[PDB]
């Protein structure tokens, strides 16, 4: 399925080239600009632990998920992944534990050394 597809075909968007964050563009966005570090970003997302045990969606709260890019308010894989997106784009992001919650995890929600899958839509972005 989608997680197996991104695990084998996704573009490695990490700086170390360690395959820690893998990406596939599923819906091309509009405009050639991506957000800058510090920008406020608005997304919709559907996330799960790679093994189908826990799920979380911005849609569960009936509102877009808002955060400041590159500030460490979300896991590393999100700060790296959302920075590559254009407005209106939908991507699939596979995140290894080194760019997510690591060996410590985030109990009770996330176990030790967990891989996470996200389908993210970048709705909009604006400067500081
Ligand atoms: C710099 O490192 C970290 C920074 C932040 C965190 C906390 C977790 C972060 O969640 C995330 O970053 C990701 C990506 C964005 C959507 C939520 N995320 C999740 O993993 C989900 C998630 C949602 C959660 O709540 C809906 C969580 O509870 C707070 C949660 O706790 C670990 C994790 C999981 C996705 C897979 C299935 C289980 C749930 C999160 C969850 C919920 C809301 C968040 O809001 C961030 C933005 N605001 C901005 C305004 O000021 C407060 C922060 C962020 C851990 C960090 O590392 C240890």
Residue located nearest, by CA, to atom 34 of ligand 1: 56
d(CA 30, CA 27): 10
Residue 118 appears among annotated catalytic residues:
yes
d(CA 42, CA 66): 5
Cα 114 to averaged position of ligand 1 atoms, centre (Å): 14
Residue 7, helix vs strand vs coil? helix
Of residues 99, 101, 117, 125, which has the active-site annotation?
101
Polymer length in residues for the chain:
128
**Residue ranges making up the domain that contains 32:** 1-128
Residue located nearest, by CA, to atom 2 of ligand 1: 75
Q: Which of 127, 124, 126, 128 is nearest to 44 (CA)?
A: 124
Q: How far is CA 126 from the centre of its chain?
A: 18
**Long-range interactions of 65-69: CB distance < 8 A, separation 24+:** 66/40, 66/41, 66/42, 67/40, 67/41, 68/38, 68/39, 68/40, 68/41, 69/35, 69/36, 69/37, 69/38, 69/39, 69/40, 69/41, 69/125
How many separate domains does the chain show? Answer: 1
The enclosing domain of 119 has a CATH number of 3.10.50.40
Expressed in Å, this structure's resolution amounts to: 2.1
């Amino acid at each position: 399925g989608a997680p197996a597809t991104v695990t084998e075909q996704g573009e490695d968007i990490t700086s170390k080239k360690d395959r820690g964050v893998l990406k596939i563009v599923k819906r091309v966005g509009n405009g050639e600009e991506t957000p800058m570090i510090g920008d406020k970003v608005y997304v919709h997302y559907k996330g799960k632990l790679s093994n189908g045990k826990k799920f979380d969606s911005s849609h569960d709260r009936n509102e877009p998920f808002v955060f400041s890019l590159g500030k460490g308010q979300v896991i590393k894989a999100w700060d790296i992944g959302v920075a590559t997106m254009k407005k209106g784009e939908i991507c699939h992001l596979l995140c290894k534990p080194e760019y997510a919650y690591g060996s410590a995890g985030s109990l009770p929600k996330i176990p030790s050394n967990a891989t996470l899958f996200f389908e993210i839509e970048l709705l909009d972005f604006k400067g500081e």
